[PDB]
Structure 1
Amino acid sequence: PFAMQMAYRFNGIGVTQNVLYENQKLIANQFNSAIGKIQDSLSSTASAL
C-alpha cells in the first residue's frame, strides 16, 4: 500500500515513520498543491522547455 511505501521512504531519509502516519492528510494535501503548481506553471509561461 502507498502510505506504507511513503513511510518506508521517510525512514530512508532519517525520519521515523510515525511522523508520516500522524501527518498523512497534511502530507497528501501539500503534494496535491505542488502538482497543481507544476500544472499551472506549464499553462502560464513561455520558455520552460
Structure 2
Amino acid sequence: WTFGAGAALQIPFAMQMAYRFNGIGVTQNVLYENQKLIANQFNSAIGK
C-alpha cells in the first residue's frame, strides 16, 4: 500500500502477506509455516 501513500517501495510478497495477517490480528508464524497451503488455496479459488 505504500504506493498509495507516496513513492513506491518494494517488498517481498511473503512479507507483505505477513503484514496483512498481523493486520487482522494473527501472528506471522502462522503464515510463515503454512505458506504452501495458503498459496494452493488461493490458486484453487481463482480457478473456481
TM-score (norm 2): 0.76
Which deviations, in whole Å up to 9, do the C-alpha atoms of 1:7-29 show, x marking residues without a partner?
00000000000000000000000
Partner of 1:13: 24
Extract unaligned runs of 5+ from structure 2.
1-11
Q: Percent of counterpart pairs with the same letter?
A: 100
Extract unaligned runs of 5+ from structure 1.
38-49
* 3-state DSSP of counterpart to 1:16: coil
TM-score (norm 1): 0.74
Indicate the structure (1 or 2) with the bigger Cα radius of gyration: 1
Aligned residues: 37
